[PDB]
């Protein structure tokens, strides 16, 4: 019993994945690449 639109319009970010063992280490090679840097983080 209202005509207002204010009242009629009036949650986790993380998913628990199953992890029985520690994760594997896939094969990497060298990389000589600008633009993207995986070391420099922002603490």
């Amino acid at each position: 019993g209202d005509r207002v639109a204010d009242m009629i319009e009036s949650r986790a970010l993380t998913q628990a994945l199953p992890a029985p063992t520690g994760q594997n280490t896939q094969v990497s090679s060298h990389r000589l690449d600008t633009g993207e840097v995986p070391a420099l983080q922002a603490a």
């Binding site: 060298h30 000589l32 600008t34 633009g35 840097v37 070391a39």
Partner: protein, 245 residues
Amino acid sequence: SDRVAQLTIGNSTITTQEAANIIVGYGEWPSYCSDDDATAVDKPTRPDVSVNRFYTLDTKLWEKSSKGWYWKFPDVLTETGVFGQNAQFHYLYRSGFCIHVQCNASKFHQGALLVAILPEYVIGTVAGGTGTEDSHPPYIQTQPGADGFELQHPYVLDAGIPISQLTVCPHQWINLRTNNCATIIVPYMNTLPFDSALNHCNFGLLVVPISPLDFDQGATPVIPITITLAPMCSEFAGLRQAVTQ
């Protein structure tokens, strides 16, 4: 997306967040010797991790009155690590290089460098001053090793060639208002596909301040220049006992 980079090869990585860009010398990456080119008939060794590392070699202090330095490659690494052990056992050798020279400064310092490569950088002398006595350069001016050597007359690069057109050869600049490092990827350039690592030095890394360092007094007066290099796609052949020279 160009100022920030990371170069990981071997077990050693270097991060840079004020880079210029990576230039690849003469437009091609270092690669292994194909069977169209190889003449040696023994199977080469390829260590693939233990010698493809960024070896940090030395640290030259750059003051306001410097001339310039040069390092003969690969004789900077025939005294260091598993590269220096494989190059002394094996007669033949080929590799490329990823050459990274760091020189940081504040946002009040100024000055520019020309870190450039040039292949077959042979060294002349001053010919006895007046130019009539055939003096040959000593072994330490020829091949200084990891210690480097300082240029006497950098306008002629100690070879009678002007530095004004050194910019033909693979190079990039370190001016302290824009970047702090300079990556130069160099392939293997030589006529014959392998060569000796103790006699022949394929190229020399000229690092010359063209625009001099300047800073008002009160800032940090010690501005180092450290060069790190990584032999890429290196392979050796012809195993015998250790020679050192």
